[PDB]
Amino acid sequence: MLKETYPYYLANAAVYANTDLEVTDKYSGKVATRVALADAKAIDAAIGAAVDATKPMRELPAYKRQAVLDHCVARFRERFDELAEALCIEAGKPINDAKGEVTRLIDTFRVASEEAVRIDGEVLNLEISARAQGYTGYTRRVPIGPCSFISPFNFPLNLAAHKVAPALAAGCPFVLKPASRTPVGALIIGEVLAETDLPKGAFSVLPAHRDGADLFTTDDRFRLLSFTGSPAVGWALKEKAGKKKVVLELGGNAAAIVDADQLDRLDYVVDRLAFGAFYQSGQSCIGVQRILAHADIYDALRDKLIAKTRSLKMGDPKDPSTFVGPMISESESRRLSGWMDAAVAAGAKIVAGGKVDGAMFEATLLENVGRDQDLYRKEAFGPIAILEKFDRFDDALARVNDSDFGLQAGVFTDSLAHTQQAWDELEVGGVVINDVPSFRVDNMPYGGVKDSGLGREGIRYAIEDMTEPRLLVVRRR
Amino acid sequence: MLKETYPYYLANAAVYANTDLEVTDKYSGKVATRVALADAKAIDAAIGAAVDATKPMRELPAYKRQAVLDHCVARFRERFDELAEALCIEAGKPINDAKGEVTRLIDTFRVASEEAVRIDGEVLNLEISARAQGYTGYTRRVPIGPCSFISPFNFPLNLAAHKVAPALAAGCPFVLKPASRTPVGALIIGEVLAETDLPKGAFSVLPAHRDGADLFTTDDRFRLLSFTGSPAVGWALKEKAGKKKVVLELGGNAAAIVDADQLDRLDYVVDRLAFGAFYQSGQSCIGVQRILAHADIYDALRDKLIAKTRSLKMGDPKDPSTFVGPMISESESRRLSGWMDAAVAAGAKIVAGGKVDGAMFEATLLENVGRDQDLYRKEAFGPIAILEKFDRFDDALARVNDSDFGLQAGVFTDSLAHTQQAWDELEVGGVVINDVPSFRVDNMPYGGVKDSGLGREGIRYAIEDMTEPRLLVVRRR
Amino acid sequence: MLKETYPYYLANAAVYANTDLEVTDKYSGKVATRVALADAKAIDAAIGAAVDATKPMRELPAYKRQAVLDHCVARFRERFDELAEALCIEAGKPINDAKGEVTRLIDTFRVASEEAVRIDGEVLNLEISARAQGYTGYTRRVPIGPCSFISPFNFPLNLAAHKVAPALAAGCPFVLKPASRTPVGALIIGEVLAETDLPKGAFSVLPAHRDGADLFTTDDRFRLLSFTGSPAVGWALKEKAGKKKVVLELGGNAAAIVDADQLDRLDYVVDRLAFGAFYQSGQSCIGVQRILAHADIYDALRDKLIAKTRSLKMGDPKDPSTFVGPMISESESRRLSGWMDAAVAAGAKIVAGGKVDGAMFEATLLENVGRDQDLYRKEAFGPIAILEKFDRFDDALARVNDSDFGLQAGVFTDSLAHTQQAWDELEVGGVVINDVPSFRVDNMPYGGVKDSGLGREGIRYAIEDMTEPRLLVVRRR
Amino acid sequence: MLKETYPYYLANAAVYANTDLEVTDKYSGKVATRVALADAKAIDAAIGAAVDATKPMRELPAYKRQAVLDHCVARFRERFDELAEALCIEAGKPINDAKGEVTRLIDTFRVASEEAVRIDGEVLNLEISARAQGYTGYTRRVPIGPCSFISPFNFPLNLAAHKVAPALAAGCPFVLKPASRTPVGALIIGEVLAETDLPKGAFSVLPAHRDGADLFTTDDRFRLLSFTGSPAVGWALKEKAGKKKVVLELGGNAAAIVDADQLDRLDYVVDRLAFGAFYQSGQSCIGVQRILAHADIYDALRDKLIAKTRSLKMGDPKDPSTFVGPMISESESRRLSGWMDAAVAAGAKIVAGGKVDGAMFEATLLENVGRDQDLYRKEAFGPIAILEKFDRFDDALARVNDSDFGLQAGVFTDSLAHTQQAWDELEVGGVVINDVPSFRVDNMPYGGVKDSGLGREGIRYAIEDMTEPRLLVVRRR
Ligand SMILES: NC(=O)C1=CN([C@@H]2O[C@H](COP(=O)(O)OP(=O)(O)OC[C@H]3O[C@@H](n4cnc5c(N)ncnc54)[C@H](OP(=O)(O)O)[C@@H]3O)[C@@H](O)[C@H]2O)C=CC1
Ligand SMILES: NC(=O)C1=CN([C@@H]2O[C@H](COP(=O)(O)OP(=O)(O)OC[C@H]3O[C@@H](n4cnc5c(N)ncnc54)[C@H](OP(=O)(O)O)[C@@H]3O)[C@@H](O)[C@H]2O)C=CC1
């Protein structure tokens, strides 16, 4: 059970300012807790404190930044079940998927702990011509300054971690705005950070609705905005950011290709397709939305995938036997069911699932979806997948690329040539081979091209964005 | 002598579309040549051709990109004197400084030739926890796509090279808009590239005035805008760029510190201060504008710097004995002379030089300039320097940092502690030790923080910005 | 108190084979414990088991190797005081220096834990010319195979750790022979490793006297010999090693230079000189043996160093107020006192200390030692230091280099030029600036040139030596 | 035609000391030239001069080392046909293969030119724990010192280049002993180097027979021996080398696997198998000796390979239509024909070729060769290949590994799983996919494990071996 109320964190300190943000249990619909909602005055105060903490943060030695991160790792391990249960409530996340997220939260912070003590530089040969005889270069990474972080509803812990943990490793103060539907995970991160010896102003965690969050984008005291969320929002915020650096982690309509040589592997393939399409009710930025299957294996794959989809239990996410929990809201279920209805009216067929009861949307598989349909081209963000057929690998690649988006794609194949062609031709951040696009391991470079992002996360890459190189050129004569 | 007319380059081809852009000899004021001016229809056509060339460019093997760059190097060596003389005319650049720029143009292209065949990736351990057993990552750099390049008047060849050469190494088509006051250097680069086997649309070089250049910032078919020019313009273009990545190389009011231990080195220090403050008439983004001298050596430095400044010959830049050529225009000379007059009226003193005859602005040294004056705080971009005194090194560092800007700074010292403190505390892209901030070698990371830039040039760093990483995750079971 | 007896570790298992190796308390001289001594049959069996464990070790995933190392870290933290007290007894090491070594043991294993999950490779551009169009390279590091490790008496824990920890990170089975005078630390490492899930044959820890240890050098089933010990032994073993790779970590007569600018820093300098010369009774491979002091500060340094040397308490290493413990044996004290006597007979002067009572050799400072004396040129390995004067920095560098050896040197200076010159000219593995040569941090590359070594330790560098690169060249057509 | 006589190069200077080494045309058998043979007095003088050149070489700036290498590249391009014709004569190398070697000589020197200006170091975080607060590390690569180089007969130019070019890039003086059967290529390299501004003693090129070459291994003034040649010699020299570092590039009995999925690719596979087995008469350290073909494609591959082998013209290597030139001597042809006869007597069958006329050994293919035969297990080094069959991929890998050797192997496959398994399991330096093991590109890491080598060549890797790291540790307080 969640605590009755939660504070926000203003310049490292818990402030029980109000109880104005109600957070519901996404399965029962009951109010599960109330948290303090930050207004513009509080946001402004947090930003000023972050400016004031910039020098103290920059002066922390590497091993001290590591020690802060290690304290977080230890506390997250100690509170593992509490954290997983909180995710289950506030995100409606099936308990096995919630435990999966807490395991990843720990991985992300542990990678950051390791990277905090290996932010190395280079000794550069500058003697490339006679004019530069006797010069040598030395590099270091300096913290960029105060960072503005905005995170989405669907991984309340780990996607905040992908900003918070590298900021601490890099030596940047930050102000984090979690999603209002799922703020508790970030507030527990804040609680744990408040136990450490960080300078005042090193961090704030401030719940705020989007309509009250302008300063997170526009305030000129932030030197970086790093936003994870919908493409419609992220590209709009880039336009308003001003001088600061912008990093965007957005969405897409990810595809998985199943090649002709997969007959003897179909039970594995189907298990992974069902995971990617339907885990956490399809609410993943790399959830499987489109499945392109080679004609040689299409019928066998279809039959097994219909049976697998029908087998997935929907219900209370606290029950470990539940695979499909509630979607995040009835309004989001209605968005997706409208797209599904429109695809069917235009000729598509529901071949497994299809029933929708409020936010309880069954795992659903469709055939014959037109490539012009919203269900095909927009980001479904729910427990639906589209199955389509191809006859030659080039056509599968073209159809994956027939999208505004480009986050990840997956290919199940034993062909070396097809693996190489996919790497060459798929206009995505990441191509996964012999697993779904929905796979991520927390050290890997991660992000999108096209409308799906601008930049990469994963600890090393976030540290790079959160620092500025400073060159020392030394002339000897 | 320049050719009578020059074409522009539209999708690799010379087009003598008109003679509407007059280019003056900046010393005599006479029209030296006329070049074709691109309109919006031509700019749009160039962008479409760049889209069409994206796939052919991406498919060029590394050694073929290298061969294009090597052809450029060979031709620039063959045409060395022609190129230097063209710079002398169109930029009013003293012939020794013009030869210096051509030497650097060759360095920049040679570094790019070397880097074109070493765009390596990583094999990443992904087995950081049990969930990721059997996964491995492989990385590559993919060209970002069509690039929009805008360059300034003062290094007509080398600052274009810092965009063009890495684009070719990385496999990106590009459209370059040179400065209208100095377009010839870029058009000679275009002429040389037109001799190579590049696919149609690989490059365009299009003169256009700023008021006709909106598409270089706003067109959504470009995936990167890389702008080198004034801070007032660059920050405004970032706001209008839309989704594309933005790189900015801007300006500043660079300082050099002369430490207490420099008495026996003062003739060297003074020679370098005069170079940094007055070469190419102070028209460098890292020209020395402010000189902070320790009280122990202030008087001796002052005396030598007055004598050195008075010794610098001003006149015809074609004469190898000329040190100070014309400024780029009478209007720019009038801007700077107005700031100088205002500083004097407020209490400053001209201690060497000070005479202004049209665009012929003498090398000038001032004392007693208030830190609130435009001459102190804005970008002088002319042959003036301000001398000021300090008593302890911390105060010198604070005064360097007392600026909107942060491009480079220099420190003449033999103190290891002061060298370390400068690297820690100077909020600049680069700190130069025992030379002026005006030093750059073309492989080094180069750029500004604060209002002076966003990102780095130097070949390796430009290639990074002109590419997207693409991860291949391979699962073995 | 040590346990009454210790086993050896044969293919991961404790074997109480005999009690034939007596280990004395180096202060009291009493037998403190008895340990099992391995004969040739046991050594041969260990090597065969290491061969048999090669494939299982190579197949362990990275995170499992990390988990083994993490178990060691946790157990060493839990047993910190026990480990420090054991060092105090078996090595006669002052308790503060013993705690220092255990702290370093933990650092070494923690660095190895981090490095175990970042043994990355490269994706290499191979398209350097037309013949190689369509080829790409991919690299990995494969364990070299069974490793033979030999460690010395003076850091019974940490110098074994610098071989054991990287071997585990790299996936190599190993057989370790500790020093017979100080085997207990290695046997506690073995005890802790025996608690982990490693495959049988992953490790053996076998006490054996040098005269029974031929197989550690000659057996052809080992693919690497890594030896830490005296130069006279190491160079002789290289000759007998056969086909295997050889890494040598040897000794020297390390020097510290004190520059002319150090007057206001002399109390710091003297504190560090006394640490480097006299900690663990001078029994460090990078102990300060020679002190070169600039004429400007010589007298002031001399006076302070005489007073500091006289202040160092000699006695029972279990007492935290003891600075100078016993030397490792009376025979080693007699070796050094003979060299000291010979230097005095030839004209040197003892200016502080000089009294020798069995293995209790006082911290001692000499002046006027001829550069031809054994005390100058050979490895003292005891609590003596020689002070000499210089007038110009070039002469100090020449005198540091006037040696068979080249491990580390130190320079106390604030001159940037002198720092640069020292890095250029000192023929050593490592140059330390503003600390003694006796400083090491366990991640840094570490080793000697000239007669002082061949190769580097420090975790990353040891992993490199304990692996073979394996290139995959893939041709696409 | 070769020149009538050639000098040797002693400390950069041509010395026509004698004409005692006759070099034959390996096709006609006539003496083609006579070269000066170095005695022990000359070898000793060269070594002393290399010691004397160590400091001047170390002080050369990077761009000057690059300029020396660039001069070599330009001269080799200018003299391309001369160099190829000399190889044709002294090595009996078919002119197309000789031109191939000269092309590679240029690649090797060009890679070295590029690498000479990018010998970078690292700025290392040393703040891993509180003891190391305020310390930072900086690295550089220092030349190791004088190098001893020994090269073999079969690539008279390029295998010398793989030692000479990195030595120059790294700043090491060297003494090169080419093969007495083929010294001319190395003497032309020496002639070209003698045109450059290198300090006296930077290089010597000294022909000497093995029985007069002891000092190349034993002299203690060399700090590295790098040997390319037979395994029987290389392992013996390691035993005699003393203190110096040893690098070995040796031989093997390389295998190519043809997988079940290759039917539609067999003409390509057969073309590459014939190249690898029979180019330069099989005289390659990575020549194809063993061909393992999957049962599904065995008969079709066999038929095509018999026809291809029979089609290869044997004769005068000056004729561009000749594929198979003479072997290096009649004695080497007799060695191999004896092994072939013994394999046939034990049950093997010659299925194509088999005729031997002096040094003219036809391209030959055998079936049914016992795995215990010398022809199978020893290094053939001539134009013979053995064909054998397998039914499952694991067995093919085991049979490749059933050898004393481990240089390179090749696998023709479209299976991703088999590619991965080959990389995991083949105990070789390099695994080539979709080409023969006989492929090398001159920048790639290259060398053997097991009895085939110790260390890697390829420019970057040779530079690493020819340098020592020197760490600078700087403490700030
Ligand atoms: N690339 C990646 O790593 C991932 C990206 N995503 C993407 O996130 C989306 C789903 O998450 P969801 O939370 O619904 O996304 P939203 O874009 O609706 O919201 C994301 C965050 O942005 C905030 N926000 C919205 N508008 C503004 C604004 N004008 N100013 C400031 N903050 C604002 C929200 O605040 P509030 O809601 O409190 O009003 C929330 O904190 C999908 O598109 C998905 O692909 C998800 C996970 C992975
Ligand atoms: N890994 C690699 O890069 C390559 C290795 N090789 C290997 O080289 C061999 C073929 O070449 P080959 O020339 O016949 O090899 P050898 O081993 O017969 O001779 C190689 C070189 O070593 C010299 N040499 C031989 N014995 C001594 C000695 N005691 N002291 C000093 N020098 C000595 C030879 O001198 P001289 O002949 O003048 O008496 C020659 O210069 C094969 O085993 C092949 O695999 C070949 C090419 C590639």
Superfamily of domain D1-251+442-477: Aldehyde Dehydrogenase; Chain A, domain 1 (3.40.605.10)
- The closest-lying atom of ligand 1 relative to the alpha carbon of residue A155 is 47
Question: Per DSSP, what are the bridge partners of residue A373?
Answer: none
Question: What is the residue whose two structure tokens read 């402010």?
Answer: B290
Do the beta carbons of residue A84 and residue A102 sit within 8 Å?
yes
C344 CA: distance to closest CA in chain D (Å): 34
- The 3-class SS string of chain B reads CCCCEECEEECCEEECCCCCEEEECCCCCCEEEEECCCCHHHHHHHHHHHHHCHHHHHHCCHHHHHHHHHHHHHHHHHCHHHHHHHHHHHHCCCHHHHHHHHHHHHHHHHHHHHHHCCCCEEEEECCCCHHHCCEEEEEEEEECCCEEEECCCCCCCHHHHHHHHHHHHHCCCEEEECCCCCCHHHHHHHHHHHCCCCCCCCEEECCCCHHHCCHHHHCCCCCEEEEECCHHHHHHHHHHCCCCEEEEECCCCCEEEECCCCHHHHHHHHHHHHHHHHHHHHCCCCCCCEEEEECCCHHHHHHHHHHHHHHCCECCCCCCCCCECCCCCHHHHHHHHHHHHHHHHCCCEEEECCCEECCEECCEEEECCCCCCHHHHCCCCCCEEEEEEECCHHHHHHHHHCCCCCCEEEEECCEHHHHHHHHHHCCCCEEEECCCCCCCCCCCCECCCHHHEECCECHHHHHHHCEEEEEEEEECC
Cβ of A313: how many Cβ atoms within 10 Å? Answer: 12
- D264 by Cβ neighbours in 10 Å (0-12 / 13-18 / 19+) ranks as exposed
- Domains of chain D, by residue range, sit at 1-251+442-477, 252-441
Question: What is the residue whose two structure tokens read 């040590």?
Answer: C2
Distance, CA of C467 to CA of C459 (rounded, Å):
12
Query: In terms of Cα–Cα distance, which of D249, D227, D181 is closest to D26?
Result: D181
Query: In terms of Cα–Cα distance, which of B253, B290, B234 is closest to B406?
Result: B253
Question: What is the residue whose two structure tokens read 């580390």?
Answer: C408
C-alpha gyration radius of chain C: 23
Query: How far from chain centre, in Å, is Cα D236?
Result: 19
Distances (CA, A) of B157 to B183, B218, B352, C176: 9, 25, 32, 63
What amino acid occupies position D300?
A
DSSP structure class, residue C282: G
The H or E element that residue C111 is part of is helix C95-116
Q: Which two tokens stand for residue B147?
A: 């690039």
Query: In terms of Cα–Cα distance, which of C116, C64, C89 is closest to C2?
Result: C89
Query: In terms of Cα–Cα distance, which of A298, A257, A301, A275 is closest to A401?
Result: A257
Pairing of the two strands B121-125 and B135-143: antiparallel
Coil, helix or strand at residue D177: strand
Is D230 a known ligand-binding residue? Answer: yes
Question: What is the residue whose two structure tokens read 């999966």?
Answer: A100
Do the beta carbons of residue D122 and residue D137 sit within 8 Å?
yes
D72 Cβ contact partners less than 8 Å away, ≥ 6 residues apart: D109, D165, D189, D192, D193, D196
Coil, helix or strand at residue A223: coil
Distance, CA of C185 to CA of C189 (rounded, Å):
6
- Selecting from D123, D129, D413 the residue whose C-beta is nearest the C-beta of A120 gives D123
The H or E element that residue D384 is part of is strand D384-390
Q: Which long-range contacts (CB under 8 A, 24 or more apart) does C332-338 make?
A: C332/C359, C332/C381, C332/C382, C333/C358, C333/C359, C333/C360, C333/C361, C333/C382, C336/C361, C336/C380, C336/C381, C336/C382, C336/C384, C337/C361
* Annotated catalytic residue within A85, A90, A101, A249: A249
C-alpha gyration radius of chain A: 23
All residues of chain B having their beta carbon less than 8 Å from the beta carbon of residue D114 are 114, 117-118
Coil, helix or strand at residue D145: coil
Distance, CA of D477 to CA of D475 (rounded, Å):
7
What amino acid occupies position B427?
E
Distance, CA of D113 to CA of D150 (rounded, Å):
22
Q: In what order do the strands lie in the sheet with D31-35?
A: D5-6, D31-35, D21-24
Distance, CA of A31 to CA of A23 (rounded, Å):
6
CA atoms within 13 A on the CB side of C101: 30
What amino acid occupies position C411?
V
Distance, CA of B225 to CA of B238 (rounded, Å):
9
The H or E element that residue D32 is part of is strand D31-35
Question: What is the residue whose two structure tokens read 């040897």?
Answer: C250
Buried b (16+ CB within 10 A) or exposed e, C338-366: ebbeebbeeebebbbbbebeebbbbbbbb
> How is A387-410 classified by DSSP, letter by letter?
EEEESSHHHHHHHHHSSS--SEEE
Output phi, psi for A407, to 5 deg. -90, -75
Q: Which ligand is nearest to the CA of D236?
A: 2
Please enumerate, by residue number, every residue of B annotated as part of a binding site.
151, 153, 177, 180-181, 210, 230, 249-250, 379
Taking each helix axis from N to C end, the angle separating D184-194 and D62-78, rounded to the nearest 10 degrees, works out to 130
Buried b (16+ CB within 10 A) or exposed e, D417-446: ebbebbbebbbbbbbbbbbbbbbbbbbbbb
Distances (CA, A) of A243 to A221, B219, C439, D450: 10, 20, 45, 58
- Please give the span between the terminal C-alpha atoms of chain D, in angstroms, as a whole number: 70
Do the beta carbons of residue D252 and residue D401 sit within 8 Å?
no
Distance, CA of C381 to CA of C155 (rounded, Å):
13
Q: Whose CA is nearest to atom 5 of ligand 2?
A: D250
Distance, CA of D386 to CA of D372 (rounded, Å):
13
B250 Cβ contact partners less than 8 Å away, ≥ 6 residues apart: B228, B229, B230, B231, B234, B235, B285, B407, B448, B451, B452, B453
Q: Which two tokens stand for residue A437?
A: 């696009």
The H or E element that residue A33 is part of is strand A31-35
Distance, CA of D204 to CA of C474 (rounded, Å):
38
Distance, CA of A230 to CA of B473 (rounded, Å):
24
All residues of chain D having their beta carbon less than 8 Å from the beta carbon of residue B118 are 114
Query: In terms of Cα–Cα distance, which of A220, A105, A104 is closest to A164?
Result: A105
Q: Which long-range contacts (CB under 8 A, 24 or more apart) does A312-319 make?
A: A312/A274, A312/A278, A312/A363, A314/A360, A314/A362, A314/A363, A315/A360, A316/A27, A317/A26, A317/A27, A317/A88, A317/A92, A317/A93, A317/A94, A317/A95, A317/A98, A318/A27, A318/A85, A318/A88, A318/A95, A319/A95
Question: What is the residue whose two structure tokens read 């293995």?
Answer: C359
Distance, CA of A106 to CA of A98 (rounded, Å):
13
Question: Per DSSP, what are the bridge partners of residue D65?
Answer: none
By annotation, the residues of B acting in catalysis are 249
Do the beta carbons of residue C267 and residue C285 sit within 8 Å?
no
Coil, helix or strand at residue C441: coil
Q: Where are the beta strands (DSSP E) in D80-120?
A: none
A349 touches chain C (CB under 8 A): no
All residues of chain A having their beta carbon less than 8 Å from the beta carbon of residue D138 are 123, 138
Distances (CA, A) of D375 to A195, B437, D340: 72, 68, 6
Measured torsion, CA atoms of residues B217, B222, B225, B229, in degrees rounded to the nearest 10: -50
Compute the 3-state secondary structure of chain D and give helix, strand, coil in percent, each to the nearest 5: 40, 20, 35
Coil, helix or strand at residue A473: strand
Query: In terms of Cα–Cα distance, which of A235, A154, B144 is closest to A225?
Result: A235
Do the beta carbons of residue A391 and residue A383 sit within 8 Å?
no
A55 Cβ contact partners less than 8 Å away, ≥ 6 residues apart: none
DSSP structure class, residue C3: -
Do the beta carbons of residue C165 and residue C466 sit within 8 Å?
no
Question: What is the residue whose two structure tokens read 């209208």?
Answer: B180
D63 touches chain A (CB under 8 A): yes
Cβ of D134: how many Cβ atoms within 10 Å? Answer: 13
- The closest-lying atom of ligand 1 relative to the alpha carbon of residue A328 is 14
Query: In terms of Cα–Cα distance, which of C270, C82, C345 is closest to C188?
Result: C82
Do the beta carbons of residue A283 and residue A413 sit within 8 Å?
no
B341 Cβ contact partners less than 8 Å away, ≥ 6 residues apart: none
Compute the 3-state secondary structure of chain C and give helix, strand, coil in percent, each to the nearest 5: 40, 20, 35
Question: Per DSSP, what are the bridge partners of residue D291?
Answer: D256, D387
Do the beta carbons of residue C359 and residue C382 sit within 8 Å?
no
Q: Which two tokens stand for residue B192?
A: 């040389």
Do the beta carbons of residue C428 and residue C257 sit within 8 Å?
no
Do the beta carbons of residue B30 and residue B22 sit within 8 Å?
no
Return the CATH class of domain C252-441: alpha beta
Distance, CA of B144 to CA of A449 (rounded, Å):
9
What does this entry list as its resolution, in Å? 1.2
Distance, CA of B241 to CA of B263 (rounded, Å):
50
Cα-Cα-Cα-Cα dihedral sign, residues D128, D129, D134, D138: negative
Do the beta carbons of residue C404 and residue C377 sit within 8 Å?
yes
Measured torsion, CA atoms of residues B312, B314, B315, B316, in degrees rounded to the nearest 10: 50
CA atoms within 13 A on the CB side of A477: 10
Q: Which two tokens stand for residue B19?
A: 């003679």
Query: In terms of Cα–Cα distance, which of A254, A217, A223 is closest to A440?
Result: A254
Distances (CA, A) of A105 to A87, D230, D446: 12, 55, 41
Distance, CA of D446 to CA of D235 (rounded, Å):
18
Coil, helix or strand at residue D58: helix
Do the beta carbons of residue D400 and residue D386 sit within 8 Å?
no
Distance, CA of C272 to CA of C263 (rounded, Å):
15
Cβ of B312: how many Cβ atoms within 10 Å? Answer: 18
Cβ distance D429 to C139 less than 8 Å, yes or no, reads no
A420 touches chain C (CB under 8 A): yes
Query: In terms of Cα–Cα distance, which of C143, C242, C120 is closest to C468?
Result: C143
Do the beta carbons of residue C332 and residue C298 sit within 8 Å?
no
B6 Cβ contact partners less than 8 Å away, ≥ 6 residues apart: B33, B34, B35, B36, B183, B184, B187
Distance, CA of C148 to CA of B168 (rounded, Å):
51
What amino acid occupies position A121?
G
Measured torsion, CA atoms of residues A189, A190, A192, A197, in degrees rounded to the nearest 10: 140
DSSP structure class, residue D38: P
Buried b (16+ CB within 10 A) or exposed e, A156-177: bbbbbbbbbbbbbbbbbbbbbb
Cβ distance D139 to A121 less than 8 Å, yes or no, reads no
Q: Most A CBs within 10 Å: which of D128, D257, D433, as the mutation test of the A interface?
A: D128
Q: Which two tokens stand for residue A462?
A: 């976030």
Distances (CA, A) of B163 to B149, B428, D270: 7, 22, 46
Question: Per DSSP, what are the bridge partners of residue D123?
Answer: A121, D138
Query: In terms of Cα–Cα distance, which of A372, A364, A343 is closest to A291?
Result: A364
C467 touches chain B (CB under 8 A): no
All residues of chain C having their beta carbon less than 8 Å from the beta carbon of residue D108 are none
- Please give the span between the terminal C-alpha atoms of chain B, in angstroms, as a whole number: 70
B105 CA: distance to closest CA in chain C (Å): 23
Do the beta carbons of residue A86 and residue A76 sit within 8 Å?
no
